[model samples]
Target: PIVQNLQGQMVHQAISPRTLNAWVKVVEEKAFSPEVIPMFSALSEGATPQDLNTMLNTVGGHQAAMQMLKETINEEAAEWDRLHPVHAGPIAPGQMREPRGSDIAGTTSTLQEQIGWMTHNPPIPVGEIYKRWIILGLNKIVRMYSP
Candidate 1:
């Protein structure tokens, strides 16, 4: 189920009776947030005190998790990219692109495929999903154009 937070962001890695048990039950049967899913899952594995303390030793363990997480994200990102066809491309010019505008102010360069660094906010970028380089809020702003 797609849950939302106070900011209304989707709970990508959710928690509920579905995912948690003894080591990580919802307090008072409350709902859960995305950030805690991995943490709680590790706890559910039932690490011993010394194992936990070695991790509490911080530096090396943190590096291991961070490095592993980076690699994991790379794998997940590769899969996501595989699912997306027009993901990103070499920056180019367009007709409506002829009068391209900066997101902040004034005219700017060719609105390129910036899938990796979209300005889409509040939620994940909606801009990269479309065919043009138009702003996320106004993709249908014009008549004849392609990006």
Candidate 2:
């Protein structure tokens, strides 16, 4: 159903607005034609060398798609960061010492490690991340398409 919807959108988009629709149309027409029935038939029969190859290719394609998405999102995010600068507040002086006494330095080190982990491993949804990318890209695209 998603593929069908994508196909229709691809057709429409290919015709108007952006020409990216044409590429999608070509892929749908050539790579995903009805003549590919034998490929599915072979897969249903059993595992064969061709099946293995196809599986490998599918995995590679999935990985490539994900990588592409990630890279695009990162690029968009970098642009966003450049536009909106972030500032961090200073850490409290005595707040760092009282908890662990002489081990305050060690505690500070541990805290820094924990902060690093939290900074690098933010808990955001993948879809939200991609949505942000799309929003950023759309902003740029709109400016270009505007005038």
Candidate 3:
């Protein structure tokens, strides 16, 4: 389901307005801080990655925007986990459930460790950071419920 959803979103190059709006609201309320609110707001209104690069140039430049984007993604992941707590014990084979924290911890930690340096001193493409966040989150959930 996640993979299908990913393909549907990515193949069309459109993110859900609701998801983007929710994140912007969260950022506005100090969930991840206020600096990225502009970027998130632009995104909510269908801004492109190129636009994000321009916005980053205005607010914090490359490395600073990279760090803020990474932390914002982490906050979103953390929020997802908080909203959907998992239960102990397996329900049955083929049943869908949220991944356990143990399953998720290493993946997100590795993302944090690697995303900045994945491009060495240059830093990753700002757009890829967002894509990786979505892909990795979906990948983890699919892996958790694989038959």
Candidate 4:
């Protein structure tokens, strides 16, 4: 979902209950550092993306927030890549190619396949599922917060 702040900037917001719960659960299961919980708590409660920035700013400022996101995203991406081991291979002119990976990997699937996996699988954190998209350049938060 999206909303407009008083300043008329688009504020990207809205997190469903399941998504929130999933992330909260992951944080607990992972036993993430205590310092980061405040940020995640705000998120789980449906804080807007912008609100999160302020919450993070108070926790340890932009540098700390960026470092936390980077660390968590790196961990999540390793799992994501493991789960999406199939690479469709290079696109070329008039060439036939086979998808490759372990038999269980998404060999016949699009990138969206595993992305959709979170919705179906349940208990997958929003961050874990979407971090790749954010970093790869669907980057509202990343570009906004980078110092």
Which candidate has the top score in lDDT? Answer: 3
Which residue pairs of candidate 3 clash? none
Question: How does model 3 fare in lDDT?
Answer: 0.42
In order, candidate lDDTs are 0.30, 0.34, 0.42, 0.41
Question: What is the full ranking by TM-score, best candidate first?
Answer: 3, 4, 1, 2
TM-score of every model?
Answer: 0.26, 0.25, 0.29, 0.28
Residue-by-residue lDDT tens digits, candidate 1, 8-106: 653323233444343224422422233344543344242222222222233232344435444443444444445554424554653121111221111
Please write out the lDDT profile of model 4 over residues 26-144, one tens digit for every residue: 54564334433444544535232233333323333345545656555455546665666655667677533322221113234443433333333342334323424333422434454
Give candidate 1 regions above 4 Å deviation: 1-61, 87-92, 95-147
- Give candidate 4 misplaced runs (Cα > 4 Å): 1-39, 46-65, 86-147
Winner on lDDT between 3 and 4 is 3
> If both were scored by lDDT, which would come out higher, candidate 1 or candidate 2?
2
Which residue pairs in candidate 1 have backbone atoms (N, alpha carbon, C) closer than 3 angstroms, thus clashing? none
Off by over 4 Å in 2: 1-61, 88-130, 134-147
lDDT-best of 1 and 3: 3
Residues 43-76, candidate 2, lDDT per residue (tens digit)? 3232222222233234323344435544555565
